[PDB]
Amino acid sequence: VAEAGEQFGQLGRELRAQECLPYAAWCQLAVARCQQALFHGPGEALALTEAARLFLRQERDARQRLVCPAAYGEPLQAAASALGAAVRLHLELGQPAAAAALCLELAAALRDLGQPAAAAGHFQRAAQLQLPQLPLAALQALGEAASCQLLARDYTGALAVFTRMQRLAREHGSPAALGAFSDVLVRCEVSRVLLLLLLQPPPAKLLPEHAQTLEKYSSSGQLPEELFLLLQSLVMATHEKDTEAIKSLQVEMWPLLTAEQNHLLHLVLQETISPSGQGV
């Protein structure tokens, strides 16, 4: 009966006014069970989302506000469980945008809490739910997934995601591109060049799309001309073995790059002077 659902609602509101977050969230789960018995799926998905927000708040107080070493993460498990249930509801209600929004909310919480590798999977789930109906939102979800994979140090997974983004942005944004998609294309292009200079694939791993990019730097289009000259100079200096060119370029490029791109250019110069995989 709905009267139990309103009483659990009142108990949740009062417990939230007392900062009793786990029991306020437990009351919202009791509302979701009342909505399920009434077959009110929209109300159930609402009740589950509010339960998850109270658990995410409890986790943020433990790991962000207080930095407790005893925080092993039990309210994040409760939050992710309730979000997954609300996503499952929105998908059978035929609402992939609401399902994507709850994936982005979990992905954001996981990224903030120091779990980028888990956040990248939820950002890619959001992109796939969005893509057939919201291409530009899906590109915004892939951009966060790439950002997470660089924080997780999965450079080849980031190279794959930026390559998917640039293909999607040409397909949905077009040789000139519309304002929002053009900004996606410039980010992908600069990040992919730096990742190809970091990763240095053999001819077995140069895709047509990767070779087609490195030919362009061996005509700036959407890139600003000064950055395009500096990137062409960096591709030449790394195809030579000119450490003093790469050093002098890194100082000229610093104001023009994002912090994520300045980290990529640091990794290129580091991998050039002290290569990975030698055990020294």
Partner: protein, 616 residues
């Protein structure tokens, strides 16, 4: 310096303009919010004139220091900041940033760039759409629409640098050489690609905050911002600015933008219960679907739509509209929500919406303010009828033929509360029923801008210069009655437009006005219009003359109802008065001239000669 040297020799005063700016920079940091508000007002008075001067480094420094105020505890400091930042021209600020070498470093020797446009747009204007105060969200939404024309981005096809961008604006002013519903545009728009690029970036940033919003306040503020953008930069004119790729073409161009976000909000358990955010979402959903038109229209349900991917979206919006109009009809008739397409009793989210609307109208029933436009039940009903009127341009008799008896039932409940929009909705039903709606009737640089394009257009111009019908009766009868008992000229215009439409559909006027009472009353209004006693007559005149001119063709009712000789004697009777020609005589002549010369004899030649004697 030349002006200051003159006043210094005349007065002996040692004062300098550079001595003022430190006092603004001090008072922006005052402990009192009222000092801080007044200091923000003082920056609003001078910041753009400073950027336009040899002190333009100080103008740039005031823009940097005022951005602190976004975190203020007082809402009037937040709205003064928004109104201040809306005055700024970012083409000019991008020029000042590009010449700065010390100001990017500031205090503490920073190593990046100022990025002032990104900080204003994202960290202030789009951030304050999430404010818990709706007064702040409204000013943030209004400030964003003022910014779109004035943003600058690199690599733009129309303006490669900020000096070319400032020269376009300065040149564009001084070197300047049936009827479809409000959201439709069938002609190929010619658009500034730079504006369409700016609009694309703004809509992408606001729709990102919408889909990622974790608070009700930010969802509501993003809807308000997108609704007002879709009004100021119409989706049907600016379709590549609105486009997110959803219809897979131009990805003469058309779009539905992000309509799937908005329809998902309209079916949520929470979002429909805020009446202001709900009514913004209806208007935006109507505008987004109407901007598909000539590409989505054909060459079965909704048979006019060849783009079958939009049919679920149109059915969803249309069925939502019928339910929320039926809720308003129940609230106005004071009928309890219990015992076809507008049925809502079995849907708990619509029962919550009913109780919000009932409570809003209960406060209206016990109060007597009649000037307030911000009344939420009336605003909501008006927005739902407006969007239904918009969606009826895509309908056919096969879509409405099961609904028309139902909708006219709801309009009879709603007519007393929103008579003007109920009359518009009747007109769109008549267009859909009779088959007269849209569904049925279907490298640049300084040399270019500062001289060469202006001179090319001027020289080319000098070169060319050398060369179911019975169901409608009680609503038409309500409209004819209320015209005689109202002082709302906006309703009176709309009833004359309904009657003009009935006459053009060849409905017999002797069925509508058998006893001649309506023509008699319309003619008796001219006494009060001529002597200056009919308030807002300037609104009603052109509709009266268009209507009487149509009545001049109906000779076959045994006798002519009025005739051009009487319409001409009414027209110069206005013209002979002390009332201003532009609001009175000219609007009376325009219906007459197009009829007598464009559309339409031994009498007719004399009438044309008499009208030319009035034009002279």
């Amino acid at each position: 310096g030349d002006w200051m040297g003159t006043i210094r020799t005349l007065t002996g005063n040692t004062f300098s303009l550079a001595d003022c700016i430190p006092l603004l920079r001090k008072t922006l940091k005052d402990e009192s919010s009222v000092t801080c508000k007044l200091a923000c007002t003082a920056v609003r008075n001078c910041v753009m004139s400073l950027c336009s001067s040899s002190y333009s480094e100080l103008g740039l420094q005031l823009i940097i220091d005022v951005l602190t105020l976004r975190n203020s505890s007082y809402w009037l400091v937040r709205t003064e900041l928004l109104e201040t930042l809306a005055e700024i021209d970012f083409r000019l600020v991008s020029f000042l940033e590009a010449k700065a070498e010390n100001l990017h470093r500031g205090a503490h020797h920073y190593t990046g760039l100022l990025k002032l446009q990104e900080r204003v747009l994202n960290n202030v204007v789009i951030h304050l759409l999430g404010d818990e105060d709706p007064r702040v969200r409204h000013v943030a939404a209004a400030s964003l629409i003022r910014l779109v024309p004035k943003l600058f981005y690199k690599c733009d096809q129309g303006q490669a640098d900020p000096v070319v961008a400032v020269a376009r604006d300065q040149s564009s002013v001084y070197l300047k050489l049936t009827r479809i519903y409000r959201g439709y545009n069938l002609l190929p728009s010619i658009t500034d690609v730079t504006m369409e690029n700016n609009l694309s970036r703004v809509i992408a940033a606001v729709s990102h905050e919408l889909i990622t919003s974790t608070t009700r306040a930010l969802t509501f503020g993003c809807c308000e911002a997108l609704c007002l953008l879709s009004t100021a930069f119409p989706v049907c004119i600016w379709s590549l600015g609105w486009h997110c790729g959803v219809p897979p073409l131009s990805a003469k161009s058309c779009t539905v933008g992000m309509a799937t976000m908005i329809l998902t909000l309209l079916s949520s358990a929470w979002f429909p219960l805020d009446l202001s955010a709900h009514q913004d979402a209806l208007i935006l959903a109507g505008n987004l679907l109407a901007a598909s038109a000539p590409k989505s229209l054909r060459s079965e349900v909704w048979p006019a739509l060849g783009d079958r991917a939009l049919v679920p979206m149109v059915e969803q919006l249309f069925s939502h509209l019928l339910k929320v109009i039926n809720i308003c009809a129940h609230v106005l008739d004071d009928v309890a929500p219990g015992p076809s397409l507008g049925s809502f009793y079995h849907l708990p989210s619509y029962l919550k919406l009913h109780d919000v609307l009932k409570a809003t109208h209960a406060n209206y029933k016990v109060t007597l303010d009649l000037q307030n436009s911000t009344e939420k039940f009336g605003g909501f009903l008006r927005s739902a009828l407006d969007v239904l009127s918009q969606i009826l341009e895509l309908a056919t008799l096969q879509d409405i033929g099961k609904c028309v008896e139902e909708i006219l039932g709801y309009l009879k409940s709603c007519f007393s509360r929103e008579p003007m929009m109920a009359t518009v909705c009747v007109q769109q039903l008549l267009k859909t029923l009779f088959g007269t709606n849209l569904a049925s009737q279907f490298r640049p640089g300084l040399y270019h801008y500062c001289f060469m394009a202006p001179y090319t257009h001027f020289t080319q111009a000098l070169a060319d210069a050398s060369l179911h019908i019975r169901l409608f009766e009680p609503l038409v009868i309500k409209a004819l009655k209320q015209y005689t008992t109202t002082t709302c000229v906006q309703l009176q215009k709309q009833v004359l437009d309904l009657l003009a439409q009935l006459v053009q559909l060849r409905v017999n006027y002797c069925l509508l006005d058998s006893d001649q009472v309506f023509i008699g009353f319309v003619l008796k209004q001219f006494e009060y219009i001529e002597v200056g006693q009919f308030r807002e007559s300037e609104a009603i005149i052109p509709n009266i003359f268009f209507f009487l001119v149509l009545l001049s063709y109906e000779r076959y009712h045994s006798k002519q109802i009025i005739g051009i000789p009487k319409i001409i004697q009414l027209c110069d009777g206005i013209m002979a008065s002390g009332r201003k020609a532009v609001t009175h005589a000219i609007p009376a002549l325009q219906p007459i001239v197009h009829d007598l010369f464009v559309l339409r004899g031994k009498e007719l030649e004399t009438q044309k000669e008499v009208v030319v004697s009035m034009l002279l």
